[PDB]
Design an enzyme around this catalytic site. Structure first.
Site, PDB file in Angstrom:
ATOM      1  CB  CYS A  62      32.740   8.238  40.842  1.00  0.00           C
ATOM      2  SG  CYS A  62      33.751   9.528  39.826  1.00  0.00           S
TER       3      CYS A  62
ATOM      4  CG  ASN B  47      28.407  -2.417  30.746  1.00  0.00           C
ATOM      5  OD1 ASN B  47      28.440  -3.140  31.766  1.00  0.00           O
ATOM      6  ND2 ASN B  47      28.373  -2.556  29.434  1.00  0.00           N
TER       7      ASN B  47
ATOM      8  CG  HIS C  24      28.587   2.253  34.433  1.00  0.00           C
ATOM      9  ND1 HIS C  24      27.816   2.896  35.247  1.00  0.00           N
ATOM     10  CD2 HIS C  24      27.857   1.806  33.332  1.00  0.00           C
ATOM     11  CE1 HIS C  24      26.574   3.017  34.443  1.00  0.00           C
ATOM     12  NE2 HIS C  24      26.767   2.469  33.370  1.00  0.00           N
TER      13      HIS C  24
END
Ligand code: W17
Ligand code: W17
Lengths: 264, 265
Positions: free
Chosen positions: A223, A186, A188
């Site tokens: 992050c 995804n 991330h």
């Protein structure tokens, strides 16, 4: 990989790969953490998920890691077969918990254990919330009803409050950035990358003379793909360290943690 | 994993993991490259190596990658089983070659192929050399004697000369550094990390709209654990082609050069 007889836990065997090991020819803590994530994903798939439930998809809710705690007694060698058992438990409306047990497939002995806390979040606003009645019911049919803890002990290391590192840090690694291999499907940043970033500020001499016994990591904020991180460490002591990951610019906290190392 | 019937090649099956896949839920080129290294290592172990021969350890010599070439037709999906066959061949005194074939375990169709060139180097001085008669004979008992090529074709992409990118580069990714997860068991940067670094200067829009079909990478010099790298890319082109260059951020010393070919999804 397969669900156990009662269908309330999942087991999977892994053969440790050549690129998965460090200088001592045994699996790194990041390889162990990746294997924990993989068996967790295979467990969720086997019981009809995707870890989103039907009510979660309708309300745009996701599970996010709040805390990860790992304790290793023996890191498996390159070519060894490790067996990992995983299970989930509901913790009322606070969130959920996923636990793991690592065993040497040949000797049958426990070589490690892990526990993680997950909280509910709206994936769009990024706002944390409590677990609703509807989600708790849909999770209970896949979880043991009586408590089952990888860390049972009263006052064990997995539930200790971690303080915030004060500047100046004893050690630091600055300008850390994620590359595409650090991202999940995804886009991330993968949770295991943060473990690697925390460990980057441990001096090489400690790594060369000690084995990592315990790691506890709190996850405060994600992050982003275009963010830059500074990794900070201070000795608090076996050797113990206090850790802090923060954004290089504004100094916004992303993670805090502690590590305990034993002399080889 | 196991050696084939004749003992001149090795096969192994892999189930694609959740953290091994990208945005399309299929294995990244770096996951494929890691699986190629793993099956190569398992082949070396099965035929008695550890892949230094007896004569190599005596003279403090090692095999080092000079070039890697990968072509993917279909990237396996998360949960799919991929079968990889690998074999080695001697190329006279120039060095050795390791080839791979990737297949979908369910359909039996070839979904990818790869080839790599390895050169002999003294471990201490880092000086390249030719393969001696004693080393050539020591590994020919583990290799097919007749040629067996993953890339047989007359002027195929795997043997093309790659030019050096001229400044200014069209795209760039600056200040790349290896972390401990990027190192192998001997504390050297893993060869797959360089593939990732090369790909970092490809713009995200190209990655989001194209699939990587071919990657050819030359290895000139190694990046040390305390080195910093700049990744440079320029478009050279339905399909998009790029020219790549990895160099040390400081002095601009060349570490790698390569080319990638991408097709529209
Ligand atoms: N956004 C995040 O990554 C995140 C992880 N945990 N938390 C808070 C848990 O109470 C926030
Ligand atoms: N990593 C190295 O030192 C290295 C790789 N290839 N080469 C030259 C091959 O012709 C040198």
């Amino acid at each position: 990989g397969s669900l156990t007889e009662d269908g309330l836990s999942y087991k999977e065997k892994f053969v440790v790969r050549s690129y998965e090991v460090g200088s001592n020819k045994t699996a790194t803590v990041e390889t162990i953490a990746n294997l924990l994530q993989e068996v967790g994903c295979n467990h969720a798939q086997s019981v009809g998920f995707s870890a989103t439930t039907t009510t979660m998809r309708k309300l745009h809710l996701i599970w996010v890691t709040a805390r990860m705690h790992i304790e290793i007694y023996k890191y498996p060698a390159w070519g060894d077969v490790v067996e990992i058992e995983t299970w989930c438990q509901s913790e009322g409306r606070i969130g959920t918990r996923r636990d793991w047990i690592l065993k040497d497939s040949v000797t049958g002995e426990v070589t490690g254990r892990a526990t993680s806390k997950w909280v509910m979040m709206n994936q769009d606003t990024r706002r944390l919330q409590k677990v609703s009645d509807d989600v708790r019911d849909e999770y209970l049919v896949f979880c043991p009803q009586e408590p089952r803890l990888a860390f049972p002990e009263e006052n064990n290391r997995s539930l200790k409050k971690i303080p915030k590192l004060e500047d100046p840090a004893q050690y630091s690694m600055i300008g850390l950035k994620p590359r595409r291999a650090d991202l999940d499907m995804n886009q991330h940043v993968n949770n295991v990358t943060y473990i690697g970033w925390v460990l980057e500020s441990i001096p090489q001499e400690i790594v060369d003379t000690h084995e990592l016994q315990v790691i506890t990591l709190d996850y405060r904020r994600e992050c982003q793909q275009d963010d830059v991180v500074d990794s900070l460490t201070t000795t608090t002591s076996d050797s113990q360290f206090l850790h802090l990951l923060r954004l290089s610019g504004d100094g916004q906290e992303i993670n805090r943690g502690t590590t305990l190392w034993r002399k080889k």
